[PDB]
Design an enzyme around this catalytic site. Structure first.
Site, short mmCIF file in Angstrom:
data_model
loop_
_atom_site.label_atom_id
_atom_site.label_comp_id
_atom_site.label_asym_id
_atom_site.label_seq_id
_atom_site.Cartn_x
_atom_site.Cartn_y
_atom_site.Cartn_z
N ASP A 105 13.50 68.40 34.42
CA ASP A 105 14.66 67.86 33.50
C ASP A 105 16.24 67.79 33.37
OD1 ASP A 105 15.96 67.25 30.71
OD2 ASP A 105 15.55 69.50 29.01
N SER A 112 30.02 55.31 33.80
CA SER A 112 30.10 54.64 34.36
C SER A 112 30.71 53.85 33.81
CB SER A 112 28.29 53.60 33.35
OG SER A 112 28.37 52.54 33.87
#
EC number: 3.4.23.22
Length: 330
Positions: free
Chosen positions: A35, A199
């Protein structure tokens, strides 16, 4: 040193991925959810409330000659999906794919919430976010990667998740046969303890690319791709019959649809998520309404590049003095 371990979807939807981990002496092998969105290594154990164990493999520290109780230490964690767990702490030897850390904090669960009990395939979590998020009190503990880093050939790990298929986590090296083209690296902020990056925009299907900054986290522990409501609306508007359902909890679509791809930007590069990766199947057994793999982040507080996005790429988690993230097509 290096390590290399295969990671395997837990079910036919890729709801999560499990990776075998050796704990203790003699080894006890547990299948953990790696994770990159959390920083605790915790396991089902001989201390877990018996009614909360249902098929998981447990760690029994009393059978490990290298286990030592970390006196006074406790842990307690709550995840973005509402699940939680807590307990006490041992140190022990932990190996992943041939790479061994001695003195790793192994957080032994005394209590787990119902969603952990109900998932017999996941024996615990192995956190790979930054150690500043570790919940051990009163002495915060380091992640497996943080403990191994100095010994690794290169201070990196990589995630190569498969679509309906096994993949690989590597530690300490970049497998140049595992991706196509080049790896594009992008800046990371550690201020929230996550692999947080920006992004450069998105496209829906064959549509034109929209240049827009999207701050989010690379999180292998989250199944879906969570993005701003404007982006998610633009995606689902291309799918006939798709709608957001408050009763179901997100966007659903006719199971008879063919979904368009979704592209996200990494600097000047582009990662393409095939449409099939966005199909999470009937909302309930036998239904013709299917659950979408791209969902709004509006209620989270952060955008999340979860498995839907990450499994379309070869991802480098670069733990150099100034951390960065790398993405390549594959």
């Amino acid at each position: 040193s290096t390590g290399s371990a295969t990671t395997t979807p837990i079910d036919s939807l890729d709801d999560a991925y499990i990776t075998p981990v050796q704990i203790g002496t003699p080894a006890q092998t547990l299948n953990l959810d790696f994770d990159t969105g959390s920083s605790d290594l915790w396991v089902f154990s001989s201390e877990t409330t018996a009614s909360e164990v249902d098929g998981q493999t447990i760690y029994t520290p009393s059978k490990s000659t290298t286990a030592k109780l970390l006196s006074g230490a406790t842990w307690s964690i709550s995840y973005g999906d509402g699940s939680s767990s807590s307990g006490d702490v041992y140190t022990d030897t932990v190996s992943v794919g041939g790479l061994t850390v001695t003195g790793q904090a192994v957080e032994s669960a005394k209590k787990v919430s119902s969603s952990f009990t109900e998932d017999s395939t996941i024996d615990g979590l192995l956190g790979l976010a930054f150690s500043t998020l570790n919940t051990v009190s009163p002495t915060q503990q380091k992640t497996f990667f943080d403990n191994a880093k100095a010994s690794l050939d290169s201070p990196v790990f990589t995630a190569d998740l498969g679509y309906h298929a096994p993949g690989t986590y590597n530690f300490g090296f970049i497998d140049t046969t595992a991706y196509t083209g080049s790896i594009t690296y992008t800046a990371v902020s550690t201020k929230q303890g996550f692999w947080e990056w920006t992004s450069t925009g998105y496209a829906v299907g064959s549509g034109t690319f929209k240049s827009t900054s999207i701050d989010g986290i690379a999180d292998t522990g989250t199944t879906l791709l969570y993005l701003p409501a404007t982006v998610v609306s633009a995606y689902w508007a291309q799918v006939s019959g798709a709608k957001s359902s408050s009763s179901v909890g997100g966007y659903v679509f006719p199971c008879s649809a063919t979904l368009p791809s979704f592209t996200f930007g990494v600097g000047s590069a582009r990662i393409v998520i095939p449409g099939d990766y966005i199909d999470f199947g009937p909302i309930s057994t036998g239904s013709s309404s299917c659950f979408g793999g791209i969902q709004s982040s509006a209620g989270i507080g952060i955008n999340i590049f979860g498995d839907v996005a990450l499994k379309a790429a070869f991802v480098v988690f670069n733990g150099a003095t100034t951390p960065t993230l790398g993405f390549a097509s594959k």
